[PDB]
Amino acid sequence: STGSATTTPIDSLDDAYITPVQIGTPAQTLNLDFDTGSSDLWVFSSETTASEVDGQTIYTPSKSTTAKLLSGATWSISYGDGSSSSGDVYTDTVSVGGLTVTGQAVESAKKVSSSFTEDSTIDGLLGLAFSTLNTVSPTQQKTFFDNAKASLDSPVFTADLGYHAPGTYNFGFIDTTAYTGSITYTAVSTKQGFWEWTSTGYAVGSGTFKSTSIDGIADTGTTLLYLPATVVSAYWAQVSGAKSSSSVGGYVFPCSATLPSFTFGVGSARIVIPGDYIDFGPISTGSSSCFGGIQSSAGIGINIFGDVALKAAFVVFNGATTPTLGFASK
Ligand SMILES: CCOc1cccc(C(=N)N)c1
Ligand SMILES: CCOc1cccc(C(=N)N)c1
């Protein structure tokens, strides 16, 4: 089997991407935030505290003839930006882009934190990291990909995120028309539960490539590119007037600037992030200070290749017995 679904930016800055997901019978379609950095599929629901729902589409398990309470199971997750959610668990039929999993754990939110409530465009998260990170207790549950894997034509999914445009998540096949050149594959460590890999270095604009190992995660659920402070300082030094602002929480730059590209290495291959992908717009409405898309990881503890990096590539998440990642230009 295969599946293919379009993923769409939630706003004009590509702050996140939403993908329609069918849950239950008859289907209830919710727009979920596919996260390769977490491993829970959770949704706003008829169980969510009413004051914490503001415009999201909810899953109502009582209206699904295939829903079953997973008795005794609870879940609770944090996103590292201060947000979190928790609740109980059902199993139900879940389909993405024509690919159907029966008995998928659907984690129903009883509580969500404010930044969830405040974003009406995100109806929940669909985790695509390794199932060892799933938070369901006392019986850990498998991700949608883990449940689908054995049925797929090939045990892979691909992320093809658009810059200020829709893109595609495919399951079970590699669309050879969706990228240019060849795909370069690189080793993955699953020891922390992430799609963790080592970039071979970077360049800023037309500058020389610096060969240096940068361990990090391929994370569709993170908006920005978080890299070591040395690398980030080297990038922003090429933007007149850019500075790290403690009050804003990262590097900002004059909105009048033209940003240089940023290249990262995948083995001997190179992925080029155009400068425009690094512009996250005014820090507040009407400001002439703009927020940068490359930020220091110093306060996190791992480097994260978030959407800023991934949207510059066609990315293969190869879930074979020994997982690997592939990157191609597009
Ligand atoms: C406490 C949450 O910490 C992280 C770290 C890295 C990735 C993610 C994620 N969900 N994409 C979350
Ligand atoms: C790692 C993904 O972290 C997310 C994703 C989507 C939304 C939010 C939020 N704060 N409302 C956080």
From Swiss-Prot:
<dbReference type="GO" id="GO:0006508">
    <property type="term" value="P:proteolysis"/>
</dbReference>
<keyword id="KW-0865">Zymogen</keyword>
<feature type="active site">
    <location>
        <position position="35"/>
    </location>
</feature>
<keyword id="KW-0378">Hydrolase</keyword>
<dbReference type="GO" id="GO:0004190">
    <property type="term" value="F:aspartic-type endopeptidase activity"/>
</dbReference>
<keyword id="KW-1015">Disulfide bond</keyword>
<feature type="disulfide bond">
    <location>
        <begin position="255"/>
        <end position="290"/>
    </location>
</feature>
<feature type="active site">
    <location>
        <position position="199"/>
    </location>
</feature>
<comment type="similarity">
    <text>Belongs to the peptidase A1 family.</text>
</comment>
<keyword id="KW-0732">Signal</keyword>
<protein>
    <recommendedName>
        <fullName>Endothiapepsin</fullName>
        <ecNumber>3.4.23.22</ecNumber>
    </recommendedName>
</protein>
<feature type="domain" description="Peptidase A1">
    <location>
        <begin position="17"/>
        <end position="328"/>
    </location>
</feature>
<keyword id="KW-0064">Aspartyl protease</keyword>
<keyword id="KW-0645">Protease</keyword>
